[PDB]
Structure 1
């Protein structure tokens, strides 16, 4: 129904202050003092941070405040922290059938910019994996920031053409991102190339990790 438009996304640095608008009308936003803001970290249960346009639960950080001017309501966050990076929604009582209409969501990106190196870990294939006859060197990269890195492989000092499958990066609990890289292989092929390696390029930086095929040699 009458969906309240919100900015698709705002971004700010720590300690700064963002504010999110909830476009509306006389029938909803500017019709009653019944707007609410919710904070949602995908995967978790939404939190009710704002209700009745300006109220705030006796437990929600006072860095969060709301209000409206005409047919527009808006949440404003002060002293951006880490937790703050989530999705924000506004909802409101309306004058029609619908008991309450919701905003379309605003994703707040709290940078922080505390840049960190991609501690990379290269794994050799596994024993069990050898049975059905499979082999895979898994390169683990974590605790890095920003969540932007490009990985490559050096198959025996030579970047031989192969099949590398760099996963869809994800954000960990510690905020820092963590990705990985896989280079599936074959029997005699992993025995042939004397030593495989991983190469994580993190913002004008590059760390290597080599793993040699073996059995306690």
Structure 2
């Protein structure tokens, strides 16, 4: 019911300052808390009561909160700081413990690399079977975070979009895929459909048409 909103991802160069925000309606009357979860490990408390460090936590970690927002700041990011960060608070009633959706923090550790994007139209066979799937294949990207938007002609498509989490490839880069399900009618009635992949502020779009 009650939600805490965080940016899905943040990139930072080693030694630079990373900021992760957390937005929630009850935060004006409630404390915020931050947890770090490295790959394959249990979470660890790094900030409590908006801005306090538990014993043992490095001083490069700091927090602040005002109104409906709390901010986790890491001043001088180390590679070992690469992890997912969750903000935590209770709902207004104080009956529910809620985490934000979490923020994936990449501390850049290999060459950046734009994603390659391959888009396939529905096959004759599938159409001939009264179904239609667009396949957007996204590979060789780093950092491992991407957002995928879809377009019908020039309009946003949101329903029927299914998109995986990025996976580490054999070469330490990342891959992901997005599927758009349509009725054959929907597909044949537009001049084109487009897959838009956003990576580190830049966007690559591939489009296909019923031809």
- What interval of TM-score do these two structures reach, taking the shorter chain for normalisation? 0.5 to 0.7
Question: Deviation at 1:147?
Answer: 8.5
Q: Is residue 2–residue 91 contact of structure 2 (8 Å, CA) maintained in 1?
A: no
Q: Report SS of the residue matched to 1:88.
A: strand
Moved over 4 A (4+): none
How many residue pairs match? The answer is 123
Task: Give the corresponding residue for 1:21.
Answer: 21
Unaligned residue ranges in structure 2 (runs of 5+):
113-141, 145-166, 175-211
5 Å-filtered alignment, 1:160-179, equals 169=168, 177=172
Query: 2-side partners of 1:24 and 1:55: how far apart?
Result: 19
Unaligned residue ranges in structure 1 (runs of 5+):
116-145, 149-167, 180-217
Larger relative strand fraction: 2
Query: 1-side partners of 2:29 and 2:55: how far apart?
Result: 26
Query: 2-side partners of 1:97 and 1:61: how far apart?
Result: 30
Q: Could you say what the CA RMSD is over the residues aligned between the two structures, in angstroms?
A: 2.7
Cα gap change, 1:108/1:69 in structure 2, threshold over 3 Å: closer, same or farther? same
Q: Report SS of the residue matched to 1:83.
A: helix
Q: Is residue 51–residue 64 contact of structure 2 (8 Å, CA) maintained in 1?
A: yes
Task: Give the corresponding residue for 2:10.
Answer: 10
Q: Is residue 11–residue 143 contact of structure 2 (8 Å, CA) maintained in 1?
A: no
TM-score (norm 1): 0.51
Choose from 41, 49, 54 the match for 2:51. Answer: 54
Q: Is residue 40–residue 86 contact of structure 1 (8 Å, CA) maintained in 2?
A: yes
TM-score (norm 2): 0.52
Question: Deviation at 1:178?
Answer: 9.1
Q: State which structure, 1 or 2, has the greater radius of gyration over its C-alpha atoms.
A: 1
Task: Check if 1:66 corresponds to 2:63.
Answer: yes
Query: 1-side partners of 2:54 and 2:169: how far apart?
Result: 31
Q: Report SS of the residue matched to 2:7.
A: coil
Q: Is residue 3–residue 100 contact of structure 2 (8 Å, CA) maintained in 1?
A: yes
Task: Give the corresponding residue for 1:31.
Answer: 29
Cα gap change, 1:89/1:147 in structure 2, threshold over 3 Å: closer, same or farther? closer
Question: Deviation at 1:103?
Answer: 0.8
Q: Is residue 37–residue 84 contact of structure 2 (8 Å, CA) maintained in 1?
A: yes
